[PDB]
């Protein structure tokens, strides 16, 4: 249909020149072989030249070597073309898709993306040049043939291809005609069949009414009118191969005829007869499979046209301006209105939340929905539907992206750890900046450079999966150590529960209290020590905050506290 | 493999000598077909003009028809053998699958009783006769093929079969070769997309730590390699076919070689070299298709082992010599427990009746575990296991078969209806003995003339299936007139359904009354119609007959009985 990819690939046609240059010579090297059975038959056996028996298999070894070479030349420089517009055209949707907003990415799409830079991503140019291999070899295969075939013998080429379609056409309907019949008399043996598959349900009463005598003659009269009708198939079938074959050998009767009484004809001598009888066996090759061309260029380019959905679509939205550098201050809630893309309910309901300067707040409970979420409004991981999060007096969508993320941290157990050294996976995106002095001395500051010890080199050994496979422990310490050598002002503590062996939550818990020590913290929790010891407590159930005070007031009135604190103890 | 087929073939092997002399005749008929490729090339255009190409075109249509007209001969008499081995051996499985117990019907096999001998029974003749029209046809053809090679110039026959196995061998360790890289590089394929799909897991960690150009500069080293392994793939598997044709052609030109040497090139003249090339081609497929003559043969023989074991597997037991030709007397139970084959948690507990001379006993409850089983083991349907079963003061198992099974009558909703006229549907099995006027007497005495008198005929129309499609309502007073016209002393009613219509119900009951003025009926029944005019009632208890007592002994005492009629009402 359209061609938008003609533009990646014009860069590189020097290939694809050469593969239709050394592609040509491998169907001028058939044609030309074909030939060679017009002297074989004619200067050599039937005579006395012995010499032309001599150099007829120097130009057959010959003409294998040209058509051996000529079929590696032409692979390899279109693979070297359709090697270059799936390699460039696969690293253009990953600068786009690291770019498209995580929603694309939530449920959208979960393991089909691979399907898009692997599979979807070939066939758009190995579908695609098999639509130059078949018309460039099978498309100058049948012009030598053609001229081969007129060069030696004008008058019965004329001949021979008028005779071409009368014959198909009476095989067709001969076909036809016989199919028909067929049909018919298959639906008579089904609406015969029926009887014998009756006769079997009337086993309950055959045997109570003392007659099986009737039963088994009148079967014998069921099955007679299934062999009677059961061999006129056969009959009506196996009719129809000697009328197709006489058809078709009624037609050679007439070659030979028309090649016998004329003396306009018997211009041939015995080799322009078989060097035109046998090249067309081998046009009717070069026939079926150019026909086949528009059935490989419309899968080719129907998997172009689902990968030009992926590209150009909705990147992230940057519509700001505002510049911050380090976020000191009070980050706070303001009519939010927010629910999740693709679902009814909402999750965020007009909240209205304070986080002062330094103090850590918590927002705990059991509810599943309500804590996760509001780290992605924090993050502007998803758009806030109505609102406004003022973020040190300005709000977020006034703020550019790179400047907010910069001021956040993730500490989790989930993290995803990249196949680098540790002076890369600590020290993410800032390696140019971050000498290797301070990344080791927070390494220790994140009470984990124990585990760095007990390594193949230590500070610049692999970690990533393919590698060493860590442990859940070892990968919170890291993003400890990561959000501690950032020094990121705001901090997401999600504070995940799992195994908490003896001195391991006891390293965790140093780390975790080292690192929210000091500066602004959102907690979300699990935890007892952390939320008696939190300034501020702050209870969301179902999208509803029930309570906004210290936890000994929330000690006072029961409401949810309490009862959570019942499976907290 | 063990061929008893045979005693069913042998008096139709007439069939099968007519199909070997002209289905041979088909195949002497393709070898002097080519045969004419000498005296054409030879004779023809290379003599003179018109010697031998006026006298051939009558040969090429004359060939065609004596292969036309043993195509038919070949394909008419093989199939009227495989058309009488099928049925003959059809209708011998249905003599013995009528006379074959119930333990087969229920759900052992229901839907495929039809497909062995419908379908099943066609594998035995149309895959075992397609192992002798290969073997014959396609095994004089070669052998045919094989005089044409050595009447003409049998030097070269011989050095041209000697080479071919060189050539098989080599084009088969070659391609072995091959697909050993092919493999190997596809796994060193496998690893690079691997390490390629570990790289879009970290989105959420890509976009908060600032770092996007990191991983547009680190896919673009793992792109690079892989496409420099994606180039080699292409490399590497396209060196296989220049090889392949190289080595095939190195034999050609040996033959060319060797047809220069004085000794060869004697007998070589403008002809015998295409007869003796060009009937190889048509020897390859004859040879190919002749591999597989016992991939069939044991296909259509395996089948004649599947419905095989329908042919011996047992039938009734007859051990019994007992008659009685009118049961004038009483039926009683011997504390008979029985469970059906197939299962393990009894389905009739041990039950103990007395059926008096001209009296109703009723099998009333809603259990529907017990009431039908005793029907079955009465009418001997099932063989009973704990104990003997007094029927006239002699045992079931004493009695033969046919003088049990002649005193009782089924009546039920369910009767099946053949599809032969109701003349013979009224005195099924029994139609000679009886004469028209009484089968139009128990019409009348069953109430159901008036809608025999609404119908095209009357006497002599067509009632069963296909036809005029009758109601149950006709179905019921059809087996009414039946069990009345053959008189049996013991009527097991089983009420059907309670489904009353107005003068619908009035004829139904006032049949199944007039049924059963005189003699012995034991009835199974839903339906308060006959329970209160019963002379005795039992009640069964889920599986256990344990109140044997009159009508206003079982209003006395509550039971079960009792509460039946609470939620029956």
Same mark, same amino acid.
């Given at each position: ?103 694309? %990415? @939530? /449920?959208? $799409?979960?393991?089909?993306? =691979? ?5 979807? #991503?070939?066939?758009?140019? !190995? ?91 009148? %079967? @014998? /009269?069921? $099955?007679?009118?299934?062999? =009677? ?5 056969? #009959?009506?079938?196996?009719? !129809? ?91 706070? %809630? ?236």
């Amino acid at each position: 249909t359209f061609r938008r990819l003609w533009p990646t690939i014009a860069p590189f046609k020097a290939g694809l020149i050469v593969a239709g240059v050394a592609l040509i010579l491998n169907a001028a090297s058939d044609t030309f072989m074909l030939s060679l059975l017009k002297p074989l038959l004619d200067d050599g056996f039937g005579k006395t030249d012995r010499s032309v028996l001599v150099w007829m298999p120097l130009v057959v070894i010959g003409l294998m070597i040209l058509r051996g070479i000529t079929s590696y030349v032409s692979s390899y420089c279109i693979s070297w073309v359709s090697g270059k517009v799936v390699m460039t055209m696969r690293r253009r949707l990953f600068g786009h898709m690291m770019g498209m907003p995580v929603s694309f %990415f @939530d /449920k959208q $799409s979960t393991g089909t993306l =691979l399907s898009r830079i692997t599979y979807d #991503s070939e066939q758009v140019a !190995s579908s695609s040049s098999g639509a130059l291999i078949t018309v460039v070899r099978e498309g100058a295969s049948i012009i030598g043939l053609f001229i081969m075939m007129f060069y030696y013998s004008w008058q019965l080429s004329i001949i021979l291809i008028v005779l071409a379609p009368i014959v198909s056409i009476a095989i067709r309907v001969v076909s036809k005609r016989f199919r028909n019949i067929s049909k018919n008399m298959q639906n008579t043996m089904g609406q015969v069949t029926t009887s014998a598959e009756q006769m079997l349900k009337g086993h309950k009463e055959v045997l109570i009414f003392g007659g099986q005598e009737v039963e088994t003659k009148r %079967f @014998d /009269k069921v $099955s007679n009118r299934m062999r =009677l009708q059961g061999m006129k198939m056969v #009959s009506a079938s196996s009719i !129809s191969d000697p009328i197709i074959q006489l058809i078709a050998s009624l037609a050679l009767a007439f070659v030979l005829y028309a090649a016998s009484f004329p003396s306009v004809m018997d211009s041939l001598t015995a080799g322009t007869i078989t060097v035109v009888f046998s090249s067309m066996i081998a046009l009717m090759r070069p026939l079926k499979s150019l026909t086949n061309v528009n059935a490989q260029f419309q899968r080719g380019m129907a998997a172009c046209q689902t990968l030009f959905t992926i590209l150009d679509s909705e990147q992230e939205k940057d519509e700001g301006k505002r510049v911050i550098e380090r976020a000191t201050g009070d980050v706070e %809630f303001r009519n939010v209105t927010f629910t999740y893309p693709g679902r009814d309910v909402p999750a965020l309901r007009n909240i209205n939340l304070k986080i002062p300067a330094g103090k850590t707040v918590a927002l705990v409970g059991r509810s599943g929905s309500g804590k996760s979420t509001i780290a992605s409004l924090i993050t502007r991981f998803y758009d806030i539907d109505e609102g406004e999060i003022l973020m040190d007096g300005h709000d977020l969508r006034e703020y550019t992206l790179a400047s907010l993320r910069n001021q956040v941290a993730l500490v989790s157990q989930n993290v995803h750890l990249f196949n680098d050294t540790v002076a890369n996976n600590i020290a993410y995106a800032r390696t140019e900046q971050y000498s290797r002095e301070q990344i080791e001395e927070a390494a220790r500051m994140a009470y984990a450079m124990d585990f760095i010890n007990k390594m193949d080199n230590g500070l610049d050994t692999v970690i990533g999966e393919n590698g060493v496979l860590l442990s859940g422990g070892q990968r919170q310490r890291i993003a400890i150590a990561r959000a501690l050598l950032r020094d990121s002002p705001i901090l997401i503590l999600d504070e995940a529960t799992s195994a908490l062996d003896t001195e391991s939550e006891r390293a965790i818990q140093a780390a975790l209290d080292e690192l929210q020590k000091n500066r602004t913290s959102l907690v979300i929790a699990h935890r007892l020590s952390t939320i008696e010891k939190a300034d501020e407590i702050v209870v969301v159930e179902d999208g509803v905050i029930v309570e906004r005070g210290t936890h000994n007031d929330l000690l006072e009135h029961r409401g949810v506290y309490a009862q959570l604190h019942k499976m907290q103890f």
